Amino acid sequence: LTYFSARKGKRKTVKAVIDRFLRLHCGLWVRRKAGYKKKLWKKTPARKKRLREFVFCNKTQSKLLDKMTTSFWKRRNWYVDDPYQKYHDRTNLKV
Amino acid sequence: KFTRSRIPEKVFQASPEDHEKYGGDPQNPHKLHIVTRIKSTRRRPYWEKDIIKMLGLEKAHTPQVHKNIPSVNAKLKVVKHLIRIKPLKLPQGLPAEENMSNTCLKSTGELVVQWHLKPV
């Protein structure tokens, strides 16, 4: 990525990352599964049910996506009727 | 392939000839072993290195007391080529709290609970 831009001297986000992923405020990245809309005629319904899911990301995938976006994308967002809003705070972890 | 070696049980069954050779009684056997490392764990597999660390025999020529129970005997059977085992014999009793400081394990295998430095 660009660590220091030529105009501002700031970091830049990679906009592929924003275009594909969802950062929850607790640090979890949500994604969509690869091939969830390809060749559905030859996939069993169990597999199609698996592909139509919002799948969390790895730890190192998560840290790779944190480094590729900026602090704007890491921020609390109090939207109006947000579908994912109950998934931001992390309930009831025992580490 | 070089693997871990099972040893059959006939190897660990004494004969009356052996009771004549060493000083053992099959009835009323000994409670405590003295184990000493007399060979290196270098050039030995990692499992033998581990068993030597568990039994507390990292330093060679240093005696260690163990129980004569089948668990400890199982670990001893794994590294029986690196060690030396003798029965801990006790001519007088096991040491009381009076004789706790003034002991000495002799070379014979006995543990004397009054260790003066005078001649008899």
Binding site: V55, D89, K94 | -
Partner: protein
Amino acid sequence: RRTPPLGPMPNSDIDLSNLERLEKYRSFDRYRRRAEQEAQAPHWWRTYREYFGRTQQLLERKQAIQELRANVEEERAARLRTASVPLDAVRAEWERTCGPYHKQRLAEYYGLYRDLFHGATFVPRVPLHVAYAVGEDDLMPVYCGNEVTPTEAAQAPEVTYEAELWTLLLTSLDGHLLEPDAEYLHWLLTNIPGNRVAEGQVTCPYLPPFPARGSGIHRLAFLLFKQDQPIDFSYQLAQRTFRTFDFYKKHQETMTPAGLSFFQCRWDDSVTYIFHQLLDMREPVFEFVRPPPYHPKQKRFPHRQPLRYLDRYRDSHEPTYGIY
């Protein structure tokens, strides 16, 4: 490294050189028979069962059936398969001959012996008959292991049995509210002359069965005792509680059990009447509570789980707002 088998291996003795000289299972059914026999045998390997477990009679019977097959309408009806059987004769003669062993099976299956006598099995020789009055017309019979409502069992039943003293006992093997071991009796009539019941010494008088709501389905024991020498004995549920084992231990010298009939009860509205009216307490209501569902330990990064994973581990389904 082979270790040799402990006992005999299966398929050893039949293993010969000439299989074609050995006659085979031509069917599926014969293999199922032999196979079930080998299932029931004790083996030395680990099996499922370890973990989850006079002359005049034959004379009159031979002449009786020999006279029975000789009639032409019996053969003609039986070959046209319109012959039937009178169920009543079979019922009463079953009550006579081999009924006691079957009532022994039903008492062993319903756990009356492991609970009522700590495993002391016996045989109900007496063909006892108990029935509860259902109004004035009909009457609900008690056979071994039936379902009878406590409305039907509101009033003490009619007991008829063909015999010649007696002590009759009713208990509720499971209906005990406090102690998980004892049982509330319901009526214990003693020193009974012959086969009339009314002239018995009513020691503990009749309660109806009271199973609590949602506490499942109860079994209720009618013991009937051959008494030799007439002995003297002895709404508070601390007073209806005893155990039939050490009760019978006090009196097993001159008394032996001779009859069973037991039945099931569930809740009904009459049991509301029993708890409130005549016991004078609030009724207890039970519910069958299943154990909470296992979920594994929650991870920081639940890799590849769906988004539903965060809901397995939350406890409120309402928007929490935190410090704001």
